[PDB]
Amino acid sequence: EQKRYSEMTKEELQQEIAMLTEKARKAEQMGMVNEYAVYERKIAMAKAYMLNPADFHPGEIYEIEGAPGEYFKVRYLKGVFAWGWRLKGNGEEEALPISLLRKP
């Protein structure tokens, strides 16, 4: 029965991502925009657990993966999350999976 992403090995995370990727693909062909975005969030989360939170630092600003020209300013890290805010948007704080920050 389903393991949480935080308990999976790399091999399990990769298999979960492959499965989610195929559903995301069909959702896209069918035009199920909301279902597609749900699968993409899960994929981002699974990817985050294959990255190193240490590569990210408070005060640093990063390009946002899947969104050219947009940047995120990191206030602080927690687990596989970076809390901070998008520059081009409102100063509202937001938690973003580290997989959505373009590596150094």
Residue numbers in the entry: 5 to 108
From the paper:
The crystal structure of a conserved hypothetical protein, GK0453, from Geobacillus kaustophilus has been determined to 2.2 Å resolution. The crystal belonged to space group P43212, with unit-cell parameters a = b = 75.69, c = 64.18 Å. The N-terminal region contains a helix–turn–helix motif (α1, Lys14–Met34; α2, Val37–Tyr53). The C-terminal domain possesses a β-­barrel-like structure with four β-strands (β1, Glu64–Ile68; β2, Ala71–Lys82; β3, Phe85–Arg90; β4, Glu98–Pro101). All other results from the search showed that the structural similarity occurred within the distinct domains of either the 44-amino-acid N-­terminal region or the 54-amino-acid C-terminal region. Hence, we speculated from this analysis that the N-­terminal region of GK0453 may be involved in a protein–protein or a protein–nucleic acid interaction. Since the functional tetramerization and the critical residues for enzymatic function are absent in GK0453, it is unlikely that GK0453 possesses an activity similar to that of DHFR. The domain bearing these residues, which are responsible for recognizing the methylated histone tail, is absent in GK0453; however, the GK0453 and MRG15 chromodomain structures both possess similar hydrophobic environments. However, the structural analysis suggested that the β-barrel domain of GK0453 may also be involved in protein–protein interactions with an unknown function.
